[PDB]
Design a protein around this nucleic acid. Structure first.
Lengths: 153, 100, 205
RNA sequence: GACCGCCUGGGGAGUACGGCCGCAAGGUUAAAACUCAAAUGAAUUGACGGGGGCCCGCACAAGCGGUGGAGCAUGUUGUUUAAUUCGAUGCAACGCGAAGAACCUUACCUGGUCUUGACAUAUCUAGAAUCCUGCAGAGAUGCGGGAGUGCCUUCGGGAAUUAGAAUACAGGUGCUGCAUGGCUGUCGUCAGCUCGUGUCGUGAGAUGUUGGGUUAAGUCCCGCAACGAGCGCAACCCUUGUCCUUAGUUACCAGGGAACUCUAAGGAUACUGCCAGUGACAAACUGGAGGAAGGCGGGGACGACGUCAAGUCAUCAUGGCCCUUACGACCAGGGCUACACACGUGCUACAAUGGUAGGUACAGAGGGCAGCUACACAGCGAUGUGAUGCGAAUCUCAAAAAGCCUAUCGUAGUCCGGAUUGGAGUCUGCAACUCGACUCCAUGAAGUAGGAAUCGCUAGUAAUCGCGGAUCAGAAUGCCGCGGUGAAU
RNA sequence: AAACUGAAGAGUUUGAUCAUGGCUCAGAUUGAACGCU
């Protein structure tokens, strides 16, 4: 807003892992307020990748892929006397997680697998090694930040 | 509304009141399954032969005070304009400004 | 045109409806129409005696009309012969006996309708609107109102361009819901058009 | 005080002409006609600035979902019509008046008709009104036959009543919202807008109301030639959030009970009240405890002085103007529903976070005799018949849908989408052709995510899912509400 | 004794103001003309 910084809402964890990170990703996958549909999409993706990779605890795998997708430097528009400068700045960690989750969902939304859960699992697997449209978007953002790398205002 | 239209509604309701009972008995006769087919056919023929304004379908609800056809409320019998005037004056029992 | 009715917005918090009966969803419409007919008939007939608060409450067919006037003597008549005619005229155009029991306003300068109708009568008697307005303000203020506002709107003094004028004295806090503000709005049919007269009399809490 | 220079409305004009000076550029001296009732100076109050400072609002930014592309609904323009009735036109007209046009509504067109008239008072002739009838006509209407003889006072007769006898008149949604009242929009729920007395200025005016903070707030405190007040802000009102008390049916079910939920009245609590800091020894802010709730707990109603000659003379009322065998009045049919088109609001979609077929759950609010219907039977269905309960915390609308489990479809213009058309029906209604809504079978159109552009939303919100009501005989995708799931930033 | 007696402003520039400043008017007069009488 314009005056204060709101106290953030509490997010209850996912029922089947007890992790607020997976709960927040379920929210990012959600549409029209359908928690059950979003939860089954995300859980199908997670069980698919877990059964394919033979990993007992996939929350750590999700943390790994999330930190791999997270950018560190984002380009912000600044105004100095009528000049629009694309100054690269750091990303605060909350925005880091939000951007990573949004990029993962929007990249998984455009793939070619049959089910959305299969699409999301394939995208998680791909970003685990370092490929996929989430990785391309992160690389694009880093590319623009380094392309400027000349305004430290 | 026009005084002519108010009187036209009045004379349209007069026939409805005059043929209210005849329509009821005739309607029971035409809907009677035990009644003969030609009997109910003739009764329906008479119903279609009744004067036009006798039907309660041609009746248009109008404000009692102003005679306005649009914006009528059954419970109060008045158009929205004078309904609001009397509610705000306090002349209408029970009714007040609502909020929830 | 941006203000709520002072009576209506206070209809449940500190004021009361000047109609206290109960009906059924089907009967209510005809009760209300008969009520409005009686009110308009009364306000046209007793236009000489300064009535201001005709109240209609009808217990089970028989009604108890209560008119409050500043001049009960003229409307009652001699020995009470006008009141009987009024009784029977009410009964004729209602169902069954309408017992009209008549109150008395002991302070006609604190009732907004009497003030407004006085200003209206003065305006129709081709009296200066500014003088009538100021006279009403003085009368109410020295009769003991905690506040009076009077607004005169129209072609004042025959002016081609209508204008709105007003005077306020005291408080008259319209937005306070517990304010006990009487309000009246009447019209004076002058020779150049209608002049609206609005009166707010604030009396306490 | 001495002497000198200069001015005498603004333009025309420091221009013309003539002198003088100059190489020239030009300078200098210096008119007039004509033209206009002003042109000016300083200050004041506003407004405005591609001036400055400080601040707020879904204003932007950060996000979520749309509109603009398709079909359809609805409104408007344009066009077309005999008419496609009238009004609303930047925000703040365009699902607006209209909370619901087959007839009626209806105000428009075509035709058929009436002239104190459909309606009020003045009047005198007969009769209680009122009911049942026949024919002609599309109907309005026209011409005829029977029954009844009121009631109180009673031979003056009266509240009502049918057909006129005529003058007043009635009637007009005819015009002027730029003559008006009343009502409404809008800036804007923005925090402002003023007044009295005092003081200052020749004065318009100023001060107060500015300044230092602070606040959602001209909120509050402190300063201060101001001292005070008023309308605005806040509070008082309604709803929701916890508890207590009275009460326990048609409500409830822990062990007939008087526990509980609930219902609906009255109250309790919340006050920066306590703690720690920051702050001018302040207002206040920041964090903490307790508590259901913490700082305005959430939502609403409440809309200052005024602005737009804003909207409405077609709710109504009204000044004036206009028509009175007509612009008044009655009836039938048609139109307001036409469509080379354009735009505004929406609904349904373009699918797999889905379609379909089976099971299995969980609401709230509102309506019901101008009716809702248990149940049974018949029907593929809409519905139809019999019948039952309920003026409802009793009976009913009524099953909530999204949701969950299983199967299937497997990315296709398809098992997506459901327009358009053909056929057959059910209801409502005098009447469904113009022009109703549903049902069934068949058809299966565009549409695969939408250009420039643009909109709403800060939390139980957006998004999505169903359910009620007003208007209403029938006719919502609109309007007004209700709950379910429920985010991102 | 007397000749010694005489002096008015308004309108109009502005949203308003004060100033400046022009224009205009109210008076007196005539070897008058014209119009009505």
């Amino acid at each position: 807003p314009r005056r204060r910084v709101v106290a953030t809402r509490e997010i209850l964890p996912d029922p089947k892992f007890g992790s607020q990170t997976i709960a927040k990703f379920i929210n990012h996958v959600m549409s029209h307020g359908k928690k059950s549909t979003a939860e089954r999409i995300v859980y199908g993706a997670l069980e698919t990748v877990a059964q394919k990779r033979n990993i007992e605890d996939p929350v750590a795998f999700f943390e790994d892929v999330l930190e791999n997708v997270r950018p560190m430097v984002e380009v912000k528009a600044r105004r100095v006397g009528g000049a629009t400068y694309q100054v690269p700045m750091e990303v605060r960690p909350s925005r880091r997680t939000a951007l990573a989750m949004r990029w993962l969902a929007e990249a998984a939304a455009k793939r070619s697998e049959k089910s959305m859960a299969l699409r999301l699992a394939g995208e998680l697997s791909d970003a685990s090694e370092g490929k996929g449209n989430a990785m391309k978007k992160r690389d694009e953002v880093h590319r623009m930040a380094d392309a400027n790398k000349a305004f430290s205002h | 509304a026009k005084k002519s239209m108010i009187n036209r509604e009045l004379k349209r309701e007069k026939e409805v009141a005059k043929y209210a009972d005849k329509r009821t008995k005739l309607k029971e006769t035409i809907s009677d399954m035990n009644a003969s087919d030609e009997v109910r056919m003739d009764a329906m023929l008479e119903l279609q032969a009744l004067p036009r304004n006798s039907s309660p379908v041609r009746l248009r609800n109008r404000c009692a005070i102003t005679g306005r056809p649009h914006g009528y409320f059954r419970k109060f019998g008045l158009s929205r304009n004078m309904l609001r005037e009397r509610v705000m004056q306090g002349d209408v029992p029970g009714v007040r400004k609502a909020s929830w | 045109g941006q203000k709520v009715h002072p009576i209506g917005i206070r209809l449940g918090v500190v004021k009361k409806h000047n109609a206290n009966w109960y009906a059924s969803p089907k009967q209510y419409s005809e009760y209300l129409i008969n009520d409005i007919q009686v009110r308009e008939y009364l306000r046209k007939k007793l236009d000489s005696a300064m009535i201001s608060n005709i109240m209609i409450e009808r217990p089970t067919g028989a009604a108890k009309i209560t008119i409050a006037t500043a001049r009960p003597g003229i409307v009652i008549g001699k020995k009470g012969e006008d009141i009987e005619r009024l009784q029977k005229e009410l009964t004729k155009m209602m169902g069954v006996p309408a017992q009209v029991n008549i109150e008395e306003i002991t302070s006609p300068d604190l009732d907004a309708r009497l003030v407004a109708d006085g200003i209206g009568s003065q305006l129709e008697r081709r009296v200066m609107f500014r003088r009538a307005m100021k006279r009403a303000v003085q009368n109410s203020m020295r009769s003991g109102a905690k506040g009076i506002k009077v607004e005169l709107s129209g072609r004042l003094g025959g002016a081609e361009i209508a204008r709105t004028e007003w005077y306020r004295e005291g408080r008259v806090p319209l937005h306070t819901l517990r304010a006990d503000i009487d309000y009246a709005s009447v019209r004076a049919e002058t020779t150049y058009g209608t002049i609206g007269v609005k009166v707010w009399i604030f009396r306490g809490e």
